[PDB]
C-alpha cells in the first residue's frame, strides 16, 4: 500500500476523501498526504472506530457538507460496487472534486479469486467507466494479484462549465 | 465594533481550550476570537453565502449547514451569538445541542436585551433570559455577563440529573 499510493499522491498533498471507508484500512496511509481527510460511510459503527483512532479525520455519513470544488483526491477502496445510490454518488463526486482533481479506484478483479466477495457483486474497469462516464483513466496499477487500480481524471470539456466553484 | 469580545470571551474559555461550535455564525464575527481557543471549530449557518465567507477567511473551520454530522457527546462549548431568536426549528436545535454537547459542556448565549435600544433587531423578535430558559430548560445559568450595554450574556450548564442518563456517548 506504501507500494502504490505514494506514486499517486507523491507530487501533490491536499484534500482527500476516503469514500466508503468501512474497514478503515486506507486511512493511516492517507493521513500522511492529507491537508484534510474526510471519511464517508453509511455504517455508523465503522465511523466511530475511525474517530476513536484518528481525531483529525472529519467523519461524515454523506458528502453533503463537503464544500463544492474543494477536493483533490477521492478514493473508493473496494467500496463502490455495493454502495447505495450510485447516481447520487457520482453526482456528489462531480460536485466536490476540483477541476484538476483525481478519483482513485481500487476494487476486486472480476474473476473467481476464491477469497473476497461474491462474483456477482464484482465490477471491472469497463463497469466503472460506465458510472464514471465523465472521466478517463490516466494510470493503472496492481495493489495485489486479486485487485486492480485506476487513477481517473475528468474528460477535458469544451461546452459550458456548469460545475460551481 | 459595538461588541469587543476580547473583554468577555477569555474569562469564559481560559481554563478550557476545546471543541467549540459557533451555532448561527452568520457574519463570522466571532470566529477569530474563537480560533484562539478551539481544538476544533465548527461554524453552523443555514445561510450558504455566510458560510462561504467563513471558508474564504478561516480554512481550519468546519462549516456546516446544520449540526447533524457533528458527533454525539463531542463538544465543550456552543455559542449562540445573537442568533437563536430567529433560528428555524428551535426544538430541533435544543435537541441537537443536547446530543452533541458533553456532560460537562457549556452553552454561551449572547443576545440583545428585550427593550427598545434603538439599535438592533426589531423588539418583537427578541428574547430575554427568561425566554432563553424556556427553551434551554434542561440547563441552568452558571454565570451572567454584559458584553455591551444593549446585550446580555449567559453561560449555561446542564441541570444535574438523578435518573437515567439516555444521552448517548
Ligand atoms: Zn469503538
Ligand atoms: Zn436510495
Ligand atoms: Zn469546475
Ligand atoms: Zn466570498
Ligand atoms: Zn422546520
Ligand atoms: Zn451524557
GROMACS .gro file of C-alpha atoms and ligand atoms in nm:
model
  340
    1UNK     CA    1   0.000   0.000   0.000
    2UNK     CA    2   0.311   0.200   0.059
    3UNK     CA    3   0.391   0.011  -0.266
    4UNK     CA    4   0.145   0.208  -0.483
    5UNK     CA    5  -0.013   0.503  -0.302
    6UNK     CA    6   0.295   0.732  -0.291
    7UNK     CA    7   0.338   0.704  -0.666
    8UNK     CA    8  -0.017   0.858  -0.688
    9UNK     CA    9   0.000   1.137  -0.421
   10UNK     CA   10   0.378   1.177  -0.449
   11UNK     CA   11   0.359   1.518  -0.616
   12UNK     CA   12   0.059   1.692  -0.458
   13UNK     CA   13  -0.054   1.674  -0.091
   14UNK     CA   14  -0.415   1.805  -0.037
   15UNK     CA   15  -0.787   1.749   0.049
   16UNK     CA   16  -0.867   1.381   0.035
   17UNK     CA   17  -1.194   1.190   0.066
   18UNK     CA   18  -1.200   0.826   0.164
   19UNK     CA   19  -1.544   0.744   0.017
   20UNK     CA   20  -1.679   0.425   0.174
   21UNK     CA   21  -1.400   0.361   0.421
   22UNK     CA   22  -1.560   0.061   0.602
   23UNK     CA   23  -1.251  -0.134   0.729
   24UNK     CA   24  -1.054   0.192   0.794
   25UNK     CA   25  -0.755   0.025   0.632
   26UNK     CA   26  -0.659   0.305   0.395
   27UNK     CA   27  -0.687   0.592   0.641
   28UNK     CA   28  -0.346   0.569   0.802
   29UNK     CA   29  -0.196   0.566   0.453
   30UNK     CA   30  -0.389   0.874   0.351
   31UNK     CA   31  -0.325   1.084   0.661
   32UNK     CA   32   0.041   1.141   0.556
   33UNK     CA   33  -0.072   1.312   0.236
   34UNK     CA   34  -0.382   1.494   0.365
   35UNK     CA   35  -0.428   1.863   0.444
   36UNK     CA   36  -0.785   1.748   0.531
   37UNK     CA   37  -0.913   1.396   0.531
   38UNK     CA   38  -1.283   1.312   0.519
   39UNK     CA   39  -1.411   0.957   0.572
   40UNK     CA   40  -1.760   0.887   0.445
   41UNK     CA   41  -1.953   0.576   0.528
   42UNK     CA   42  -2.321   0.491   0.577
   43UNK     CA   43  -2.223   0.248   0.864
   44UNK     CA   44  -2.210   0.442   1.193
   45UNK     CA   45  -2.004   0.179   1.388
   46UNK     CA   46  -1.731   0.198   1.125
   47UNK     CA   47  -1.721   0.577   1.154
   48UNK     CA   48  -1.689   0.552   1.535
   49UNK     CA   49  -1.388   0.320   1.507
   50UNK     CA   50  -1.219   0.573   1.283
   51UNK     CA   51  -1.296   0.873   1.514
   52UNK     CA   52  -1.153   0.672   1.808
   53UNK     CA   53  -0.815   0.621   1.627
   54UNK     CA   54  -0.790   0.937   1.426
   55UNK     CA   55  -0.927   1.256   1.577
   56UNK     CA   56  -0.824   1.484   1.285
   57UNK     CA   57  -1.036   1.298   1.033
   58UNK     CA   58  -1.373   1.453   0.952
   59UNK     CA   59  -1.631   1.172   0.961
   60UNK     CA   60  -1.949   1.212   0.753
   61UNK     CA   61  -2.248   0.986   0.678
   62UNK     CA   62  -2.268   1.151   0.335
   63UNK     CA   63  -2.069   1.403   0.133
   64UNK     CA   64  -2.324   1.686   0.156
   65UNK     CA   65  -2.127   1.903   0.391
   66UNK     CA   66  -1.810   1.879   0.181
   67UNK     CA   67  -1.779   2.215   0.005
   68UNK     CA   68  -1.811   2.237  -0.373
   69UNK     CA   69  -1.494   2.238  -0.573
   70UNK     CA   70  -1.276   2.159  -0.276
   71UNK     CA   71  -1.145   1.807  -0.312
   72UNK     CA   72  -0.814   1.697  -0.466
   73UNK     CA   73  -0.848   1.315  -0.446
   74UNK     CA   74  -1.139   1.074  -0.385
   75UNK     CA   75  -1.066   0.711  -0.301
   76UNK     CA   76  -1.310   0.424  -0.345
   77UNK     CA   77  -1.121   0.129  -0.198
   78UNK     CA   78  -1.335  -0.180  -0.261
   79UNK     CA   79  -1.638   0.036  -0.172
   80UNK     CA   80  -1.834   0.149  -0.479
   81UNK     CA   81  -1.970  -0.186  -0.606
   82UNK     CA   82  -2.216  -0.222  -0.320
   83UNK     CA   83  -2.267   0.145  -0.239
   84UNK     CA   84  -2.622   0.272  -0.234
   85UNK     CA   85  -2.740   0.542  -0.467
   86UNK     CA   86  -2.463   0.514  -0.724
   87UNK     CA   87  -2.603   0.806  -0.936
   88UNK     CA   88  -2.613   1.032  -0.634
   89UNK     CA   89  -2.261   0.922  -0.558
   90UNK     CA   90  -2.129   1.011  -0.900
   91UNK     CA   91  -2.316   1.340  -0.887
   92UNK     CA   92  -2.157   1.429  -0.549
   93UNK     CA   93  -1.814   1.324  -0.670
   94UNK     CA   94  -1.851   1.571  -0.959
   95UNK     CA   95  -1.963   1.845  -0.724
   96UNK     CA   96  -1.692   1.819  -0.464
   97UNK     CA   97  -1.397   1.743  -0.691
   98UNK     CA   98  -1.179   2.033  -0.818
   99UNK     CA   99  -1.143   2.056  -1.198
  100UNK     CA  100  -0.787   1.923  -1.160
  101UNK     CA  101  -0.880   1.651  -0.902
  102UNK     CA  102  -0.844   1.273  -0.929
  103UNK     CA  103  -1.062   0.973  -0.845
  104UNK     CA  104  -0.884   0.665  -0.732
  105UNK     CA  105  -1.049   0.328  -0.780
  106UNK     CA  106  -0.935   0.011  -0.615
  107UNK     CA  107  -1.152  -0.298  -0.645
  108UNK     CA  108  -1.156  -0.682  -0.671
  109UNK     CA  109  -1.089  -0.839  -1.012
  110UNK     CA  110  -1.394  -0.982  -1.191
  111UNK     CA  111  -1.264  -1.341  -1.175
  112UNK     CA  112  -1.312  -1.628  -0.936
  113UNK     CA  113  -1.039  -1.548  -0.687
  114UNK     CA  114  -1.159  -1.786  -0.413
  115UNK     CA  115  -1.144  -1.523  -0.139
  116UNK     CA  116  -1.310  -1.185  -0.124
  117UNK     CA  117  -1.667  -1.108  -0.210
  118UNK     CA  118  -1.927  -1.285  -0.430
  119UNK     CA  119  -1.852  -1.267  -0.803
  120UNK     CA  120  -2.199  -1.134  -0.893
  121UNK     CA  121  -2.134  -0.814  -0.697
  122UNK     CA  122  -1.783  -0.751  -0.856
  123UNK     CA  123  -1.716  -0.481  -1.117
  124UNK     CA  124  -1.428  -0.443  -1.367
  125UNK     CA  125  -1.274  -0.135  -1.535
  126UNK     CA  126  -1.536  -0.131  -1.808
  127UNK     CA  127  -1.810  -0.137  -1.543
  128UNK     CA  128  -1.655   0.151  -1.352
  129UNK     CA  129  -1.622   0.370  -1.661
  130UNK     CA  130  -1.997   0.332  -1.718
  131UNK     CA  131  -2.075   0.504  -1.388
  132UNK     CA  132  -1.773   0.738  -1.409
  133UNK     CA  133  -1.864   0.830  -1.766
  134UNK     CA  134  -1.730   1.189  -1.746
  135UNK     CA  135  -1.386   1.056  -1.668
  136UNK     CA  136  -1.094   0.879  -1.834
  137UNK     CA  137  -0.824   0.652  -1.694
  138UNK     CA  138  -0.486   0.822  -1.651
  139UNK     CA  139  -0.296   0.529  -1.486
  140UNK     CA  140  -0.350   0.166  -1.390
  141UNK     CA  141  -0.181  -0.030  -1.112
  142UNK     CA  142  -0.189  -0.360  -0.930
  143UNK     CA  143  -0.249  -0.338  -0.550
  144UNK     CA  144  -0.249  -0.717  -0.513
  145UNK     CA  145  -0.286  -1.005  -0.761
  146UNK     CA  146  -0.662  -1.008  -0.681
  147UNK     CA  147  -0.730  -0.632  -0.721
  148UNK     CA  148  -0.695  -0.361  -0.977
  149UNK     CA  149  -0.644   0.010  -0.957
  150UNK     CA  150  -0.729   0.313  -1.165
  151UNK     CA  151  -0.650   0.677  -1.136
  152UNK     CA  152  -0.915   0.874  -1.309
  153UNK     CA  153  -0.948   1.227  -1.436
  154UNK     CA  154  -1.222   1.441  -1.582
  155UNK     CA  155  -1.274   1.443  -1.961
  156UNK     CA  156  -1.144   1.777  -2.095
  157UNK     CA  157  -1.467   1.971  -2.176
  158UNK     CA  158  -1.527   2.241  -2.440
  159UNK     CA  159  -1.900   2.313  -2.380
  160UNK     CA  160  -2.030   2.527  -2.092
  161UNK     CA  161  -1.879   2.470  -1.745
  162UNK     CA  162  -2.172   2.449  -1.501
  163UNK     CA  163  -1.962   2.289  -1.219
  164UNK     CA  164  -1.998   2.551  -0.940
  165UNK     CA  165  -1.688   2.692  -0.775
  166UNK     CA  166  -1.734   4.735   1.672
  167UNK     CA  167  -2.004   4.764   1.938
  168UNK     CA  168  -1.910   4.415   2.065
  169UNK     CA  169  -1.545   4.390   2.198
  170UNK     CA  170  -1.524   4.009   2.259
  171UNK     CA  171  -1.164   4.027   2.380
  172UNK     CA  172  -1.329   4.164   2.703
  173UNK     CA  173  -1.552   3.866   2.796
  174UNK     CA  174  -1.461   3.554   2.591
  175UNK     CA  175  -1.127   3.480   2.763
  176UNK     CA  176  -1.280   3.469   3.106
  177UNK     CA  177  -1.515   3.200   2.968
  178UNK     CA  178  -1.267   2.984   2.780
  179UNK     CA  179  -0.943   3.032   2.980
  180UNK     CA  180  -0.924   2.709   3.182
  181UNK     CA  181  -1.070   2.505   2.898
  182UNK     CA  182  -0.943   2.510   2.533
  183UNK     CA  183  -1.165   2.259   2.344
  184UNK     CA  184  -1.418   2.161   2.077
  185UNK     CA  185  -1.634   2.467   2.010
  186UNK     CA  186  -1.940   2.523   1.793
  187UNK     CA  187  -2.043   2.868   1.666
  188UNK     CA  188  -2.415   2.798   1.609
  189UNK     CA  189  -2.563   3.060   1.377
  190UNK     CA  190  -2.228   3.206   1.279
  191UNK     CA  191  -2.366   3.441   1.012
  192UNK     CA  192  -2.139   3.744   0.989
  193UNK     CA  193  -1.840   3.528   1.112
  194UNK     CA  194  -1.754   3.799   1.358
  195UNK     CA  195  -1.678   3.568   1.646
  196UNK     CA  196  -1.460   3.319   1.456
  197UNK     CA  197  -1.119   3.490   1.502
  198UNK     CA  198  -1.183   3.523   1.870
  199UNK     CA  199  -1.291   3.155   1.898
  200UNK     CA  200  -0.997   3.030   1.690
  201UNK     CA  201  -0.755   3.118   1.972
  202UNK     CA  202  -0.947   2.869   2.197
  203UNK     CA  203  -1.067   2.583   1.976
  204UNK     CA  204  -0.908   2.240   1.926
  205UNK     CA  205  -1.187   2.217   1.665
  206UNK     CA  206  -1.413   2.496   1.545
  207UNK     CA  207  -1.746   2.428   1.379
  208UNK     CA  208  -1.944   2.708   1.217
  209UNK     CA  209  -2.313   2.638   1.153
  210UNK     CA  210  -2.541   2.854   0.943
  211UNK     CA  211  -2.837   2.795   0.718
  212UNK     CA  212  -2.716   3.092   0.505
  213UNK     CA  213  -2.497   2.927   0.233
  214UNK     CA  214  -2.312   3.251   0.138
  215UNK     CA  215  -2.233   3.343   0.501
  216UNK     CA  216  -2.052   3.010   0.521
  217UNK     CA  217  -1.865   3.080   0.200
  218UNK     CA  218  -1.712   3.397   0.351
  219UNK     CA  219  -1.613   3.197   0.660
  220UNK     CA  220  -1.441   2.935   0.439
  221UNK     CA  221  -1.260   3.207   0.240
  222UNK     CA  222  -1.105   3.357   0.560
  223UNK     CA  223  -1.058   3.064   0.801
  224UNK     CA  224  -0.960   2.735   0.639
  225UNK     CA  225  -0.935   2.523   0.957
  226UNK     CA  226  -1.306   2.598   1.036
  227UNK     CA  227  -1.552   2.317   0.972
  228UNK     CA  228  -1.857   2.483   0.807
  229UNK     CA  229  -2.191   2.301   0.830
  230UNK     CA  230  -2.545   2.380   0.714
  231UNK     CA  231  -2.665   2.200   1.022
  232UNK     CA  232  -2.524   2.010   1.323
  233UNK     CA  233  -2.611   1.659   1.202
  234UNK     CA  234  -2.253   1.545   1.118
  235UNK     CA  235  -2.108   1.664   1.447
  236UNK     CA  236  -2.056   1.355   1.661
  237UNK     CA  237  -2.252   1.270   1.972
  238UNK     CA  238  -2.118   1.394   2.304
  239UNK     CA  239  -1.813   1.556   2.146
  240UNK     CA  240  -1.849   1.931   2.219
  241UNK     CA  241  -1.722   2.155   2.500
  242UNK     CA  242  -1.870   2.494   2.415
  243UNK     CA  243  -2.161   2.605   2.191
  244UNK     CA  244  -2.202   2.976   2.125
  245UNK     CA  245  -2.532   3.137   2.028
  246UNK     CA  246  -2.440   3.495   1.944
  247UNK     CA  247  -2.747   3.699   1.850
  248UNK     CA  248  -2.863   3.401   1.655
  249UNK     CA  249  -3.112   3.184   1.847
  250UNK     CA  250  -3.403   3.422   1.843
  251UNK     CA  251  -3.458   3.399   1.470
  252UNK     CA  252  -3.340   3.044   1.418
  253UNK     CA  253  -3.553   2.785   1.243
  254UNK     CA  254  -3.668   2.470   1.423
  255UNK     CA  255  -3.588   2.578   1.775
  256UNK     CA  256  -3.688   2.239   1.926
  257UNK     CA  257  -3.464   2.060   1.672
  258UNK     CA  258  -3.183   2.297   1.773
  259UNK     CA  259  -3.218   2.224   2.151
  260UNK     CA  260  -3.234   1.857   2.074
  261UNK     CA  261  -2.905   1.874   1.874
  262UNK     CA  262  -2.744   2.094   2.133
  263UNK     CA  263  -2.819   1.820   2.387
  264UNK     CA  264  -2.687   1.541   2.168
  265UNK     CA  265  -2.353   1.698   2.069
  266UNK     CA  266  -2.263   1.868   2.399
  267UNK     CA  267  -2.056   1.671   2.659
  268UNK     CA  268  -2.195   1.610   3.009
  269UNK     CA  269  -1.973   1.894   3.139
  270UNK     CA  270  -2.015   2.115   2.831
  271UNK     CA  271  -2.127   2.478   2.839
  272UNK     CA  272  -2.368   2.684   2.627
  273UNK     CA  273  -2.290   3.053   2.583
  274UNK     CA  274  -2.579   3.287   2.497
  275UNK     CA  275  -2.529   3.643   2.380
  276UNK     CA  276  -2.834   3.833   2.263
  277UNK     CA  277  -2.996   4.174   2.257
  278UNK     CA  278  -3.186   4.300   2.560
  279UNK     CA  279  -3.563   4.281   2.527
  280UNK     CA  280  -3.622   4.658   2.541
  281UNK     CA  281  -3.610   4.927   2.276
  282UNK     CA  282  -3.240   5.007   2.245
  283UNK     CA  283  -3.289   5.184   1.912
  284UNK     CA  284  -3.013   4.985   1.753
  285UNK     CA  285  -3.055   4.612   1.691
  286UNK     CA  286  -3.327   4.385   1.557
  287UNK     CA  287  -3.700   4.459   1.594
  288UNK     CA  288  -3.818   4.439   1.953
  289UNK     CA  289  -4.073   4.162   1.869
  290UNK     CA  290  -3.819   3.902   1.768
  291UNK     CA  291  -3.611   3.947   2.089
  292UNK     CA  292  -3.572   3.714   2.381
  293UNK     CA  293  -3.454   3.778   2.739
  294UNK     CA  294  -3.301   3.536   2.988
  295UNK     CA  295  -3.638   3.410   3.092
  296UNK     CA  296  -3.727   3.332   2.726
  297UNK     CA  297  -3.398   3.157   2.676
  298UNK     CA  298  -3.451   2.932   2.977
  299UNK     CA  299  -3.792   2.818   2.846
  300UNK     CA  300  -3.601   2.666   2.550
  301UNK     CA  301  -3.288   2.566   2.734
  302UNK     CA  302  -3.498   2.407   3.010
  303UNK     CA  303  -3.254   2.120   3.088
  304UNK     CA  304  -2.992   2.384   3.173
  305UNK     CA  305  -2.917   2.632   3.446
  306UNK     CA  306  -2.738   2.964   3.440
  307UNK     CA  307  -2.390   2.935   3.585
  308UNK     CA  308  -2.262   3.288   3.507
  309UNK     CA  309  -2.403   3.617   3.373
  310UNK     CA  310  -2.223   3.897   3.192
  311UNK     CA  311  -2.289   4.219   2.996
  312UNK     CA  312  -2.099   4.211   2.663
  313UNK     CA  313  -2.234   4.554   2.579
  314UNK     CA  314  -2.492   4.791   2.728
  315UNK     CA  315  -2.756   4.662   2.487
  316UNK     CA  316  -2.678   4.289   2.519
  317UNK     CA  317  -2.696   4.028   2.789
  318UNK     CA  318  -2.484   3.716   2.816
  319UNK     CA  319  -2.527   3.377   2.985
  320UNK     CA  320  -2.310   3.076   3.046
  321UNK     CA  321  -2.524   2.772   3.090
  322UNK     CA  322  -2.453   2.418   3.217
  323UNK     CA  323  -2.667   2.108   3.217
  324UNK     CA  324  -2.908   2.050   3.506
  325UNK     CA  325  -2.770   1.773   3.737
  326UNK     CA  326  -2.991   1.459   3.685
  327UNK     CA  327  -3.059   1.181   3.940
  328UNK     CA  328  -3.236   0.946   3.693
  329UNK     CA  329  -3.147   0.760   3.376
  330UNK     CA  330  -2.880   0.908   3.150
  331UNK     CA  331  -3.002   0.824   2.799
  332UNK     CA  332  -2.768   1.080   2.636
  333UNK     CA  333  -2.557   0.865   2.400
  334UNK     CA  334  -2.182   0.865   2.438
  335LIG    ZN1  335  -1.508   0.166   1.928
  336LIG    ZN1  336  -3.161   0.545  -0.224
  337LIG    ZN1  337  -1.520   2.345  -1.235
  338LIG    ZN1  338  -1.669   3.545  -0.083
  339LIG    ZN1  339  -3.878   2.338   1.008
  340LIG    ZN1  340  -2.405   1.208   2.877
   0.00000   0.00000   0.00000
